[PDB]
Nucleic acid binder design. Structure first.
Ligand code: MG
Length: 778
RNA sequence: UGGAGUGUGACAAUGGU
RNA sequence: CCAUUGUCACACUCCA
C-alpha cells in the first residue's frame, strides 16, 4: 500500500542553520500542453534532431504559431505555453547541410514540472554543451590547465525533486578536462615538453601527436577571413620538417602545414587521463565545503533562470539562493569502559576519540597463537619483535596476551599457502594435547596477489581458524596507533566487545533497552566479472545480546546473478525425513540470538541497505513478507514489530553551515558538525525520512547518510529514531571514530565483501562453526 | 590486507514513456 | 530516452 507516515519532528539537540543545495522552484501551473511529431524518416542523433526542430520552428515562429516558444524533449513530444489555435497544420521543412517530412497534426504539479525539467534541459543544451548527462560550461570558475593542454572547468547537473518545501531544482558540481584552444605549435610544445621548431620530432613522438590529434577539429589559419573548420583526415608520413596534415576526404588528399591549424574546443572527451593528471584534477575537483557552496550558488546565478525567454513565457521562478533550513544537532552519547583503566567514561568530542589510559570492556585473553611469515624480506627476528610489540600493545590496551607463541614462527612461501597453513594448524594441534588455535598472525607481502584470498579462504572455510593479517611495511615501521587499531580487531574477533553505550547498560535508551530488540542489517555485492556465471552474494548481520547491542554475527549465502533483493531470507525445501523443513538466514540468526542471550527477541529493527527509490515498495514487500514468514515459522503466534530503515549514501544533497567563520565546523574540512539531522524542508514530504551526518569530515564536503524509514509498527518517535541511530552509529568495533552509515548496515556490506573470496546457484562453502559465532569478517 | 573519509574511471541493477 | 540507486577498481587525505 503506502509507506509509514511521519509522526512529527524532533526537538532535542542544539540548534544550527544548514544551507543545503535545493533551490525552490515556484511552479507555473497556469497551462501546459503536450504534442507529438509525425515524421516519415527517423533520426537517432539527439543534437541533429534538436537542430532540425529549432530550424523548423524558426521557419514558422510567428507565421502560424504566434508569440510562442515550444519545447522538445528529444522524443515524440512538444511542449508549448498552451493549446495553439491551429489543428491541421502541414509542414515539410527540410534540412540542408534531405528527405521530405510529411506531417498531419490532429496531477497539476507533476506534469507541469516535468515540462519544467524539459525546458531546463532545453536551456542547458541551448547555452552549454552536453556530456554524459552533466552539462559543462567553460566560463564558470576561470578554468585553468592542469596538464599539457588539458584544462578543466567546473560543470554541473540538475535534477528536479518533489521535496517538502514545494518541489525544487537540485544542483551539484562535476568537473571534466578538455583540450586548450591553443595553436598546434604551443600544443605540441607542451605535449612533448621540448623544443620542436629547431628539433625534428621522433617517429614515436610523431605517432603520439597524431593519436592525440585524431578526431580533433582544426580550423585553417592560412586564410585571414575564410577560417573554415575541418576534421582531421590523418597525418602525412612525410620549418619543413613538420609533417603535413591530411584534411577533408581520404581520396581528396589535402596537405596543410602543422602551423596552419588550431583547436576548436573539443566536444566529447580527450585522451584518457594519466596518473599526473588525475591527481591534479582530484586536487581541483573537490574543495572545502565553503568553495563547494560558493560554486553551487554561482552556477545558478550565472545560468540565470530568472532572465530567460523560457521563464518569461512560462513564469517559472527559481531563487538564486540556497535553501536555508533549521537542523538540530544531536548530542554525542556516553561510552563506558572497564573500571581497571584510568578513565571509565569517555565521551566523543567531534565524533572521534582514542584509548589513552582506557581499557576495553571485555578482554578475551588469547593464550594460544602462531605467526606464519609469507615473505622473504621480513625475517625471524623482525617477525618475533613485531609479534611481541603487538602483544605488549594488546596487554596495555586491555586483554592479556600470551608473550610466546605455541610454535616458532613458521616461515613459508606464498605458493605453498595451503601446505603452510595445514602444517601450522596440525603441528599446533599435535602440541598442547589437542587445543584449538585462538588466532594466527599472518604476515603477507605488500602486493599479495590472491595470497590474502587463499589464506582467508582456507582459515575459515576449511580449517576453522580465526586469522589476522598484517602487511610487510607496517611490520617494518610499526606505530602505536596502528598496533592499537589492530588490537581492536583482535579483541572483537574472539567474541569480546570493547565499547558499550552507557545508555544501553543503564537500560534507558527508548524502545530498545526495555524488551529484547535485535538490530539487523543487509547488503549485496554483485560480481562485476562476466555474466550469468559468477553469482552475486548476499550478507546479513544481527546483534546477539540485548542489554548492550555491540556483538554481531553475520552469515552469507549466494544468490542469482545480479538480483538486488536478498534472495533467501526464508526458504523451504521438502525433506521426507523431516517434512517441510525451514531455514535461510532469519531462522538461524534468531536461533543464534536466543542461544546467546536466553530470551527470544520481541522487537526486530531491520536496516536494509542499498536499494533504489524505484523498487523501495517491491523490496519492502518481499523482505517484510520473508521476515513475517520466518518468525511465524519459529514459534506459533510470534509476530514481532518490525521497523525497516533503508540507508542510502550516494545522494547528491550536500549540507553546509550557515556562517563559515564560526565554531559551527569541525577541526578540519570546516563543514557541519558530526550529528546534524535535517528532516525539515528537504525530504520526501509525506514519507518518514531524515538526512543525517554522524561522521566528522576530513576533506571535501560530507555526504550525509539518507535514512528512509519504511514500514514501521512499534511507533517510533522521530526524535527516538534520530537519537537511536546517532547513538548506535558510535559503537563501531574495528574503529574508534564515528561511522558514516550505521554499523548494522556497514557490517553487512563488509561481510558481503569478505565472502567474495570464499568461492572458487553454486552455494559458497559453509563456514566452520567455531568462526561463525564471533565477528570473523570485521 | 589497521581504520575512517572523499575524488575519479569502468561496469551494473531498478521506476515512467 | 529520461532518471533514481548499486558494485568494483584506482588515486588522495587523515588518526596517539
Ligand atoms: Mg554494500
Amino acid at each position: 500500500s503506502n509507506f509509514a507516515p511521519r509522526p512529527g519532528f524532533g526537538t532535542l539537540g542544539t540548534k544550527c542553520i544548514v544551507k543545503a543545495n535545493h533551490f525552490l522552484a515556484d511552479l507555473p501551473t497556469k497551462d501546459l500542453n503536450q504534442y507529438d511529431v509525425t515524421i516519415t524518416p527517423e533520426v537517432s542523433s539527439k543534437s541533429v534532431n534538436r537542430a532540425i526542430i529549432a530550424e523548423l520552428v524558426r521557419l514558422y515562429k510567428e507565421s502560424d504559431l504566434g508569440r510562442r516558444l515550444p519545447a522538445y524533449d528529444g522524443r515524440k513530444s512538444l511542449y508549448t505555453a498552451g493549446e495553439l489555435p491551429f489543428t491541421w497544420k502541414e509542414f515539410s521543412v527540410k534540412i540542408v547541410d534531405e528527405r521530405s517530412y510529411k506531417v498531419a497534426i490532429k496531477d497539476c504539479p507533476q506534469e507541469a514540472v516535468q515540462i519544467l525539467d524539459i525546458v531546463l534541459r532545453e536551456l542547458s543544451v541551448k547555452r552549454f554543451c552536453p556530456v554524459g548527462r552533466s552539462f559543462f560550461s567553460p566560463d564558470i570558475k576561470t578554468p585553468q590547465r592542469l596538464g599539457e593542454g588539458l584544462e578543466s572547468w567546473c560543470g554541473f547537473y540538475q535534477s528536479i525533486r518533489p521535496t517538502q518545501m514545494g518541489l525544487s531544482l537540485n544542483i551539484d558540481m562535476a568537473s571534466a578536462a578538455f583540450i586548450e584552444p591553443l595553436p598546434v605549435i604551443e600544443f605540441v610544445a607542451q605535449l612533448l615538453g621540448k623544443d620542436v621548431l629547431s628539433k625534428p620530432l621522433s617517429d614515436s613522438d610523431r605517432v603520439k601527436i597524431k593519436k592525440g590529434l585524431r578526431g580533433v577539429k582544426v580550423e585553417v589559419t592560412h586564410r585571414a577571413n575564410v577560417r573554415r573548420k575541418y576534421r582531421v583526415a590523418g597525418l602525412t608520413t612525410q620549418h619543413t620538417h613538420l609533417p603535413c596534415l591530411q584534411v577533408g576526404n581520404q581520396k581528396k588528399a589535402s596537405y596543410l602545414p602543422m602551423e596552419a591549424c588550431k583547436i576548436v574546443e573539443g566536444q566529447r572527451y580527450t585522451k584518457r587521463l594519466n596518473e599526473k593528471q588525475i591527481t591534479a584534477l582530484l586536487k581541483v575537483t573537490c574543495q572545502r565545503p565553503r568553495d563547494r557552496e560558493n560554486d553551487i550558488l554561482r552556477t545558478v546565478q550565472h545560468n540565470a533562470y530568472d532572465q530567460d525567454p523560457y521563464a518569461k513565457e512560462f513564469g517559472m521562478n527559481i531563487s538564486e539562493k540556497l535553501a536555508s533550513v533549521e537542523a538540530r544537532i544531536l548530542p554525542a552519547p556516553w561510552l563506558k569502559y572497564h573500571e581497571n583503566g584510568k578513565e571509565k567514561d569517555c565521551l566523543p568530542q567531534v565524533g572521534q576519540w582514542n584509548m589513552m589510559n582506557k581499557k576495553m570492556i571485555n578482554g578475551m585473553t588469547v593464550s594460544r597463537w602462531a605467526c606464519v611469515n609469507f615473505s622473504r624480506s621480513v625475517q625471524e627476528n623482525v617477525a618475533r619483535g613485531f609479534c611481541n610489540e603487538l602483544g605488549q600493545m594488546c596487554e596495555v590496551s586491555g586483554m592479556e596476551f600470551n608473550p610466546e607463541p605455541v610454535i616458532p614462527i613458521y616461515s613459508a612461501r606464498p605458493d605453498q599457502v595451503e601446505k603452510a597453513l595445514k602444517h601450522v594448524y596440525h603441528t599446533s594441534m599435535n602440541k598442547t594435547k589437542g587445543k584449538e588455535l585462538e588466532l594466527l598472525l599472518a604476515i603477507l607481502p605488500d602486493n599479495n596477489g590472491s595470497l590474502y584470498g587463499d589464506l582467508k579462504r582456507i582459515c575459515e572455510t576449511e580449517l576453522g581458524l580465526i586469522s589476522q593479517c598484517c602487511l610487510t611495511k607496517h611490520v617494518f615501521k610499526i606505530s602505536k596507533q596502528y598496533l592499537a587499531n589492530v588490537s581492536l580487531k583482535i579483541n572483537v574477533k574472539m567474541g569480546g566487545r570493547n565499547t558499550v553505550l552507557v545508555d544501553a547498560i543503564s537500560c534507558r535508551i527508548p524502545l530498545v533497552s526495555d524488551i529484547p530488540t535485535i538490530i539487523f542489517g543487509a547488503d549485496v555485492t554483485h560480481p562485476e566479472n562476466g555474466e550469468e556465471s559468477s553469482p552475486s552474494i548476499a550478507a546479513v548481520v544481527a546483534s546477539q545480546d540485548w542489554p548492550e547491542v555491540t556483538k554481531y554475527a553475520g552469515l552469507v549465502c549466494a544468490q542469482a546473478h545480479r538480483q538486488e533483493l536478498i534472495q533467501d531470507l526464508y526458504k523451504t525445501w521438502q525433506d521426507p525425513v523431516r517434512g517441510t523443513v525451514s531455514g535461510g538466514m532469519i531462522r538461524d540468526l534468531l536461533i543464534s540470538f536466543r542461544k546467546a542471550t536466553g530470551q527470544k527477541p520481541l522487537r526486530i529493527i531491520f536496516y536494509r541497505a542499498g536499494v533504489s527509490e524505484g523498487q523501495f515498495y517491491q523490496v519492502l514487500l518481499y523482505e517484510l513478507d520473508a521476515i513475517r514468514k520466518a518468525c511465524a515459522s519459529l514459534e506459533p503466534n510470534y509476530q514481532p514489530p518490525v521497523t525497516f530503515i533503508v540507508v542510502q549514501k550516494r545522494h547528491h544533497t550536500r549540507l553546509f553551515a550557515n556562517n563559515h567563520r564560526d565554531k559551527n565546523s569541525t577541526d578540519r574540512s570546516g563543514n557541519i558538525l558530526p550529528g546534524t539531522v535535517v528532516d525539515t524542508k528537504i525530504c520526501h514530504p509525506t514519507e518518514f525520512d531524515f538526512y543525517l551526518c554522524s561522521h566528522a569530515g576530513i576533506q571535501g564536503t560530507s555526504r550525509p547518510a539518507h535514512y528512509h524509514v519504511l514500514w514501521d509498527e512499534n511507533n517510533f518517535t522521530a526524535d527516538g529514531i534520530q537519537s537511536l541511530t546517532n547513538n548506535l552509529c558510535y559503537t563501531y568495533a574495528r574503529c574508534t571514530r564515528s561511522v558514516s552509515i550505521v554499523p548494522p548496515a556497514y557490517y553487512a556490506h563488509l561481510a558481503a565483501f569478505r565472502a567474495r573470496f570464499y568461492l572458487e546457484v553454486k552455494p559458497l562453502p559453509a563456514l566452520k562453526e567455531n568462526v561463525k559465532r564471533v565477528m570473523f569478517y570485521c
